[PDB]
Amino acid sequence: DYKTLVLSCVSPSPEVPVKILNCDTITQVKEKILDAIFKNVPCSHRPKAADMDLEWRQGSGARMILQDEDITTKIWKRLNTLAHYQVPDGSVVALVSKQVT
Amino acid sequence: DYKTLVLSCVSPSPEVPVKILNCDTITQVKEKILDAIFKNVPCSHRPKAADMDLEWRQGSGARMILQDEDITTKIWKRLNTLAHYQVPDGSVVALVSKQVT
């Protein structure tokens, strides 16, 4: 499948609606979100996709970390996408920094 | 010193005048040039500063490669800047890809 959906991204202030594809890997999703939320920051001074995690803030109140590979990936392993996780259009998401230590 | 100057950057079409500081390292100069010349390309799909070299296209007709460290660096080594190379305001420059093999 190759379809667009919208994610409502929490500001790193109002949420920002960002278009991505349902077939983008989670790393590719994170890249598009960073492009939107840090649009006026030079590339050199933006956080990198690989240093951040995507957090799905469900209507249930659960906050789930989505990534390219986890316990939900089926083994050749296909990289995880929003379609893999069945994320609905309009879902609320945040980017969360990774602990370095 | 901490002063601005303009470089006239060859399109990767007309040259693009880009502001940088005379104390920016050459890597920092390259980053600012990339920000200008690829402004509408997402960060993910831009060439990286470290994979490109800065070429000074002198009025003499000479084309010189400038970089953070070379035979002109004096030894603790300070990283090279445009002031180090005595590049005049308004100089013409290009970004050149590095051979990978």
Q: Report DSSP letters for chain A, one per residue.
A: ---EEEEEEPP----EEEEEETTSBHHHHHHHHHHHHTTTS-GGGSPPGGGEEEEEE-TTS-EEEE-SSSTT-----PPPBHHHHTPPTT-EEEEEEPP--
Q: Helices (DSSP H) in chain B: which residue ranges?
A: 26-37, 82-85
Partners of B4 in beta bridges: B21
The answer to whether the beta carbons of residues B19 and B59 sit under 8 Å apart is no
Which pair of tokens denotes residue B31? Answer: 């980053």
The answer to whether the beta carbons of residues B30 and B42 sit under 8 Å apart is no
Residue B31 and residue A46: Cβ atoms within 8 Å? no
Range of the domain at B28: 1-101
| Residue listed under structure tokens 């002063």 | B3
At residue B45's C-alpha, the angle toward residues B81 and A75, to 5°, is: 130
Beta strand extents in B1-101 (DSSP E only)? 4-9, 16-21, 52-57, 63-66, 92-97
- Provide the 10 A C-beta neighbour count for residue A94: 20
Alpha-carbon distance A68 to A26, whole Å?
5
Resolution of the solved structure (Å): 1.6
Domain count, chain A: 1
Range A45-53 contact pairs with CB under 8 angstroms and sequence separation of 24 or more: A46/B43, A47/A95, A47/A97, A49/B44, A51/A97, A51/A98, A52/A95, A52/A96, A52/A97, A52/A98, A53/A95, A53/A96, A53/A97, A53/A98
The answer to whether the beta carbons of residues A92 and A81 sit under 8 Å apart is no
CA-based R_g, chain A, Å: 13
Alpha-carbon distance B100 to B94, whole Å?
19
| Residue listed under structure tokens 């920016």 | B24
**Chain A: residues touching B (Cβ < 8 Å):** 31-32, 34-35, 42-44, 46, 49
Instruction: Report the CATH number that the domain containing residue B21 is assigned in CATH.
Output: 3.10.20.90
DSSP state of B56: E
Which pair of tokens denotes residue B49? Answer: 């500063």
Compare all CA atoms of chain A with the CA of B43 and give the residue at the minimum distance: A43
